[PDB]
From a paper:
CYTOKININ RESPONSE1 ([name]), the main cytokinin receptor, has a modular architecture composed of a cytokinin-binding CHASE (Cyclases/Histidine kinases Associated Sensory Extracellular) domain, followed by a transmembrane fragment, an intracellular histidine kinase (HK) domain, and a receiver domain (REC). Perception of cytokinin signaling involves (i) a hormone molecule binding to the CHASE domain, (ii) [name] autophosphorylation at a conserved His residue in the HK domain, followed by a phosphorelay to (iii) a conserved Asp residue in the REC domain, (iv) a histidine-containing phosphotransfer protein (HPt), and (v) a response regulator (RR). This work focuses on the crystal structures of the REC domain of [name] from the model plant [name] and from the model legume Medicago truncatula.
The structure of [name]-REC was determined in two isomorphous variants of space group P21212 with two protein subunits (chains A and B) in the asymmetric unit forming a homodimer. The second structure of [name]-REC (referred as [name]-REC-K), determined at 2.15 Å resolution, corresponds to a construct with a 9-residue C-terminal truncation and has potassium instead of magnesium in the metal binding site. Its chain A is comprised of 134 residues, including Ala917 of the cloning linker, and chain B of 120 residues, including two residues of the linker (Asn916–Ala917). While chain A has the complete sequence (Leu918–Phe1048), chain B lacks 13 residues at the C-terminus (Glu1036–Phe1048). The structure contains 41 water molecules. In this paper, the [name]-REC-K structure is mainly used for comparative analysis of the metal binding site. A similar octahedral coordination sphere of the same six oxygen atoms is found in the potassium complex of [name]-REC. The K-O coordination bond lengths range from 2.56 to 2.68 Å. However, even though the potassium cation in the [name]-REC-K structure has the largest radius among the three metal cations, its charge is only +1, which apparently is not sufficient to pull Asp1013 into the coordination sphere. Instead, there is a water molecule replacing the interaction of the Oδ atom of Asp1013.
Author numbering:
A (entry chain B): 916 to 1035
B (entry chain A): 916 to 1048
Write the structure that this text describes.
Amino acid sequence: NALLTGKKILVVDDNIVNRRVAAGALKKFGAEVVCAESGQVALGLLQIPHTFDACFMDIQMPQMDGFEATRQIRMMEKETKEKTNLEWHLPILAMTADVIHATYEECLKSGMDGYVSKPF
Amino acid sequence: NALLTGKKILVVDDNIVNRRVAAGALKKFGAEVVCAESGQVALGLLQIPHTFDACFMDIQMPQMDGFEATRQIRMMEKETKEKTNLEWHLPILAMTADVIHATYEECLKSGMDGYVSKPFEEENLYKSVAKSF
Ligand SMILES: [K+]
Ligand SMILES: [K+]
């Protein structure tokens, strides 16, 4: 509960800056981190059984986005449930930062002066 | 005498709940509020010269979104500056909540267990230096 020692985290992101920064953040608390740059690579790493304890899922990726990739992880797990009678549920947290920042850049680009924080 | 007393706010939003909430809230601070359901209505209300002190701009609207409408509010001001030399710069604040809500609803629908709001900050950020050749 204080450190991530003994945990293995999958970071999926198609931005090399995100992959490097997330991994260093998680490694500073002792996580073993594996990075994937695409949904296909992530699905290949998540063949059941795998040893990952949690996954950070970039929602915006070409060819397969994070929603699709998640849908297929859940299909993989449902298949395993049916054939092994054990329930696999990898924790998956979406990484949305790049949808929100892109949104803020179009606001500024269009000429808006700011935005409402925690808006109406 | 309340905080926005004497101020007139244009709320542009195509969702009736936001219009009702934004306007009620702003009126409690003493603002006179006008609501618009579309960018075209907003552009019509912002004929220069106008009496609006601020504008809240829904970024996601059919037919004309808030970026477009903003883009044309700025052309109006630039045209005025060019032709009259008078400086108009309406304050425009983006309303982005419903884009974040939809994204968050899509995460749930796909099967994710949650989301990270704030991005990963890097540790030694202001610790970098400019090194000279
Ligand atoms: K991305
Ligand atoms: K909207």
